[PDB]
Amino acid sequence: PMMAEAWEALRRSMVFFRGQPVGTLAAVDYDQVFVRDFVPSALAFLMNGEPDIVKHFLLKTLQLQGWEKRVDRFKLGEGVMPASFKVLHDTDNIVADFGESAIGRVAPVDSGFWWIILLRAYTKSTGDLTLSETPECQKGMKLILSLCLAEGFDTFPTLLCADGCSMIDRRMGVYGYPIEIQALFFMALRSALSMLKPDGDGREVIERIVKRLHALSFHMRNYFWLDHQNLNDIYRFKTEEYSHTAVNKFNVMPDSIPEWVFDFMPLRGGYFVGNVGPAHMDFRWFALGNCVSILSSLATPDQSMAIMDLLEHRWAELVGEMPLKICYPCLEGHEWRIVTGCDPKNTRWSYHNGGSWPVLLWQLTAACIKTGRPQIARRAVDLIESRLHRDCWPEYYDGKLGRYVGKQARKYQTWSIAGYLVAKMLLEDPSHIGMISLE
């Protein structure tokens, strides 16, 4: 079909280090190997039967994790994973970016979770348990887990985050406890138990992971979940509840709930709220967060069915003419001025502020297979197969329906192609969802 052209583009975007495939580029015209950008390419190669690139990638990124990172005078964490790295020749040499060179000095919290998830996907797709059992991978797993599982003044089981900590590397503002980071956190924890060897300290770390997983499953299914009944209850909430036994636990103002939520909420269906914190509640629908919540089994089968129901009812809003919107709705006017800090790349229905991202398709596909609703993924596949190739594989789309190409979208984006390839192979062989899902 016209998908082979996509594989030509995917193979053209390969980056080699000393003869071995180390990764895929970000854009082929974003000229380095990004972790989140390489995840779909790695899944495509794993399903096609070429897992050596993923093998080299995990190990080289692990070596980068063991580097001495420093920002002006501050020594970075031990388990901090790089956001990207580039290769040079004049004598190959790898250079990594942990946030010192990143615009705005953002921290890639999702990189470590993606590394653990990719390691689990590799060991499940290949069945070769040797790599996950190597001392290096165990060290990397413990290093990344010790950064987030460490105790602190936190009164929430969820992971606290600064703005620009997830795929959305700009102020939008994903600070606090965004569903994207919490879902990736839960998935990485569960996948960590799937391959961790209990050493003297290993048994203790496993105990910590299990306890945190229980606290997370409870906090996420009870507070982040939102359906019509729960929204009505929050609308009827009382304020100023200073007691151990309080109903309105986080003191959310019922009048502060935006007007769009009441009209957007259908009778059947629900989703996970974008953020929940002290007196804060971001009601925005985030695609990656809900998809990972479904894949990591964080959402109950009923909640997953409700997410699919909401996707079918409010389809034009969450998908439109081009899947898939990164978040709904978008920030406008004052909301854009204060939350984004007058960021011009995140305009109305743009890059991170409501833009349509084709790469998200594979996630939508995977969750759809896990929930038993393949027709939804097929609808999205037919929608993407009609315009993605014609537009030379853009990075992102803009507009309420995604009818327009992004304002600053890069053509021939690597993961925009890899996501389509992964989604098509998943539709052809659903048996691959076990590589990216848990129960």
Next chain:
Amino acid sequence: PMMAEAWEALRRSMVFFRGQPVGTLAAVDYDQVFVRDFVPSALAFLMNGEPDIVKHFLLKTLQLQGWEKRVDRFKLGEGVMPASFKVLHDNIVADFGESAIGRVAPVDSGFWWIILLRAYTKSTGDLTLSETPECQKGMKLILSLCLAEGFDTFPTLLCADGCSMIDRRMGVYGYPIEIQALFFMALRSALSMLKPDGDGREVIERIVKRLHALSFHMRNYFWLDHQNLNDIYRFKTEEYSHTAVNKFNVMPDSIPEWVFDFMPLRGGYFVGNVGPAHMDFRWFALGNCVSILSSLATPDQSMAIMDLLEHRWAELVGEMPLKICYPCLEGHEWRIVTGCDPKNTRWSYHNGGSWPVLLWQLTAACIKTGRPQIARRAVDLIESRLHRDCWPEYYDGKLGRYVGKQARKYQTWSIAGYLVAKMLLEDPSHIGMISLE
């Protein structure tokens, strides 16, 4: 003179446990023993010569630190200090955030414990309390919570909304100057009594290293004067490099208009917040005062803060010291930042309200900087209405002419701060108890 009335109120607000005085109340009509609320009362007793209450408070709060705290299914940190506690007829009950409105976390409680311990050991000279194994363990626990490794690419401590003195949503998330200044002061005061035995040698290495990272990061990025503001106004955007000028990618057009008019030619202050693409230009009183007391600010920066206080006096002080922050969020800003919080309206409780308790911080900072006349002006201005209004919790308005909308009369720390400020102005030799160099 007719100043001991405040001492009568301070002595009436004492809370005893098993016969011994353990602390002071929050309000005498906020009904428990709060850490931040007890700090000024403890300083007043330390200066008057009654340090037994401070000792019992530190020891009992340390015992509370060793409790097994739980939030629904989540085990809180080991070194987490409680925000408040009350005595029930005689068993102590503490709140670590499970009962707090909005489930806010008291990040400043741990730092306040260490600062109060240093103040006690310096005021009394009795090094025995700081050298006991229990308090040493408490110091190491609180230090291990903040010095812990993480995804952070900033030396400053990440914070959720509602982390200190502002227990509500106000935009204090990220790296607010109040928490960073208290962090720096607690870090410096921890070395003043940490023994090098066992783990002490290792932790001492950590505290010193982070102290270097903070002093730089605070003096280079958080500081703001007319020249620095002009430079940020002329900043270039989208800087992807280790050698970038606009390190945090702040949008020059996003700088609010009030900053350009508020900035005088002489003087400066520390910016309220600095984070990824975020820079809160609001002036916070407690943060700058602690930055001066902890010597975090250079002598020139402290003199600049005093210069700004003298030039834009009506804005930061007005008819009632001291405004908690300037300016206040209005309209859309209030709707988005506070989440439509009604207790923080225009020039109110946390959103620009005038707090009398802050006076002592202003006083000490004035003595350390060599500008006592400013503190005398604030004292002469406050001594005319604090007692007449039955010691309110906070004042509202652009000038503080009106009492708070929901202010509690006879607030304990509002009285203790005035007493501490008067004792500091009368005897400046006490600033060593709350300052470093």
Next chain:
Amino acid sequence: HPMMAEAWEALRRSMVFFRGQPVGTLAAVDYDQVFVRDFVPSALAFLMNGEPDIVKHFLLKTLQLQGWEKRVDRFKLGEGVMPASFKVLHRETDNIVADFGESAIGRVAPVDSGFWWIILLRAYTKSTGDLTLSETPECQKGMKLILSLCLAEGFDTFPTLLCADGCSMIDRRMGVYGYPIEIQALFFMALRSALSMLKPDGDGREVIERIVKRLHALSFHMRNYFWLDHQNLNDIYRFKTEEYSHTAVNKFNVMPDSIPEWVFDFMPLRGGYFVGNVGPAHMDFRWFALGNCVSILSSLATPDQSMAIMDLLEHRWAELVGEMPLKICYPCLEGHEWRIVTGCDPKNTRWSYHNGGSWPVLLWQLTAACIKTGRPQIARRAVDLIESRLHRDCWPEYYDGKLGRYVGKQARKYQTWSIAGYLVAKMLLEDPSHIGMISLE
């Protein structure tokens, strides 16, 4: 003090030579060409110092550029169209490259360049007394060519010149379309200075008639409609609407309720100024510095109106001048006005580049007009304010802020005309006899 010597070092370093001949000065020495409006103050400085050969070469070279074949996409430009700027192609052999709007951002047209050429020619012939240059057939042809473009007939029902946005010193979208005072004042001054040096041979007698006729139409239209004082503002506030008749009071049907709130508070009891723009149902009340200064220098404003402008400058000093002279316009567009008028232009933010920014180069105009009005203390105060910070900031292009306390957002350091304006203003303060070189009566 010899700080003018430092300013002159910078001015002489910005000289541009063409195949051995000095043709002009650059715009910025770090805007990297020879601009007409940018060269006007430098030319005045050299004329006052006694080095007029550079001005002679500039006028002749610009006339030669006027004799070029200009084209934009498929359209042949006007015959008398003057270039906005030009650059030299070094580094042994030089070559001329001119910009008439084809290379300009937004394809803006420099309407003021021709008027500045005529005004500069009059200034040269008056400063040197050498009438030979203006009487050459080439200069007469250039004057007639530029005059035939603006004096041409059209559907216009207004004596003033219709203009597109970004046609004056303000090369960007700012709402200066229509009949801005800057272009009208430069037009009036160029017309009078054209009569000051036009020969009556052949067609000249014919053109002299046109220039005179339009001058009568302008002097009236400007003094009766564009002028604005407290009494006139009160009258417009009491205006009636829908006046369809030859004898109408509200001639342009301006809505009294549409007058902005800032105008009533800004208008003092003593003093007045010329309104920024007047057209069909449109009236931009913004105060433009260059327009009023040229209206004073060209004697377009009566002595009473000039005294009123100085009175307004004394009363509303912090608004029009502040800590750094001189604001290009007052007030600035904010919020919705900025979104609609500027089209979301980021270089013209609040109290910025063209939207209320402080420009040091304007000082010389403020100086000249003050000497013409007999109020030197105003110019001396502005000179002291500039002499206290302009050199310390390495001669910025423009300043931002309500008071001008901050350097421009995108200001270029060591701007040529920002230095030349200071030198011209100081030379005018030292020898007021030079104002005749830039003024009419």
